[PDB]
């Protein structure tokens, strides 16, 4: 087999392949995660360089891992599928042996562990993908939002963004998100997620995708018109 050590240390103590994978994430379309009091919302950018697209069948940016946990990402699309597949397998394997669905923290830890394994295995390059993994634990009403990255580190976030111009939307969330009082309702959380994307997206509503996840496996994706109403209300308030 091909055994070559592609991820290795450089004199300054950096693993360039892992850092260059982060550059692939920086190139990827913006993804944002905002957790409210009784919900999590996952926002995603869709670049409008590609029109004449078929949005029914095109791979959606947010993926269900089980009926109660979702995964969005920024970076290489083809790489993300491999992680999503492995996670979905592990989700059912956990149900089969533990007789209980995965926690969001467990699922994140597994995906993060896979990403890590590829940074010190022979013959493989790291995943050019950072993920946001969100949902609710079984029989639990506390929202969960985790982030992973090519190096294999993972951590929990009140709100987080990844991908291109994530610096700008993180700037926005850092000033607008209050921990002592998060978005109390679904509306407020979605609004703050749309607002944050509107800093970078620079176009109406086709370029924004929203997915709301609520407790007890209640996941729904918003349509163009539902999102477009949020966009309208935001800019009308802004004209003042």
């Amino acid at each position: 087999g091909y055994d070559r050590a592609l991820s290795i240390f450089s004199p300054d103590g950096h693993i360039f392949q892992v850092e260059y994978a982060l550059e692939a994430v920086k190139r990827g379309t913006c993804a944002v995660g905002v957790k409210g009091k009784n919900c999590v919302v996952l926002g995603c950018e869709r670049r409008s360089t590609l029109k004449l697209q078929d949005t029914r069948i095109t791979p959606s940016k947010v993926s269900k891992i089980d009926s109660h946990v979702v995964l969005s990402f920024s970076g290489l699309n083809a790489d993300s599928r491999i992680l999503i597949e492995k996670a979905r397998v592990e989700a059912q394997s956990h149900r089969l042996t533990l007789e209980d669905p995965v926690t969001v923290e467990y699922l994140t830890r597994y995906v993060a562990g896979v990403q890590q394994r590829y940074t010190q295995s022979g013959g493989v390059r790291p995943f050019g993908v950072s993920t946001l993994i969100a949902g609710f634990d079984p029989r639990d009403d506390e929202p969960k939002l985790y982030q992973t990255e090519p190096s294999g580190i993972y951590s929990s976030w009140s709100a987080q963004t990844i991908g291109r111009n994530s610096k700008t939307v993180r700037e926005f969330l850092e000033k607008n998100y209050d921990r002592k009082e998060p978005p109390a309702t679904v509306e407020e959380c979605v609004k703050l997620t749309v607002r944050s994307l509107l800093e970078v997206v620079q176009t109406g509503a086709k370029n924004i995708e929203i997915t709301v996840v609520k407790p007890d496996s209640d996941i729904v994706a918003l349509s163009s018109e539902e999102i477009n109403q949020y966009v309208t209300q935001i800019e009308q308030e802004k004209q003042e």
Partner: protein
Amino acid sequence: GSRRYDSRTTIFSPEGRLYQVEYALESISHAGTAIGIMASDGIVLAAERKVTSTLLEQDTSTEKLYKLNDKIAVAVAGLTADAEILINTARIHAQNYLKTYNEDIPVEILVRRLSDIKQGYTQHGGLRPFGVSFIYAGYDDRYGYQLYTSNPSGNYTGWKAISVGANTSAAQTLLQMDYKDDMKVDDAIELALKTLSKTTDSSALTYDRLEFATIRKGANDGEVYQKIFKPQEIKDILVKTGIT
């Protein structure tokens, strides 16, 4: 040892790009243009052959348009030999699905499988990626008519109309200009040929240069028919649309 000679096909550049995928895409940009257009009552696949010689036996020739099963076809842009490896795999995946579930494989499942195979070559194994971009045209009872493309990176996306190979920038502008959602197969046939006719590096577009195919749910009694056009039938449709 051997390390000295290893190109390291599966690495990132400092910018976070995959060298070999990018260079394979550059390879594909020189290949003959392939166009897929999806209508409400069918799909069109049109493609330009690359090697005009008068002595090429065109009627038995197949460089661009291949059949994957009775419901799904592909248009090829890039190295034909590479595409034929992938095609034979996709043909098997279809039949495995048919043997297991006793139902024809959904279009997206076949596309994802192939795209995942292409992805594998960019992430592990140290081999060069497949220098091939596909346009998948297909039908199933869930989503109906579907167009997809995959490229050497293993990324795939869905389309209403799309071009791969040469002059895709010029071709996609022209498609974006004249495509509409209520369009029909006969209109899409015309659009496909008009687009190739403007983007072609050749002096004129002729029948001996084209491969052409349609998937219609306009077979007898609500079935789906794949038609790979014979050379005479391409010549007829060129006269009909008014190009020659």
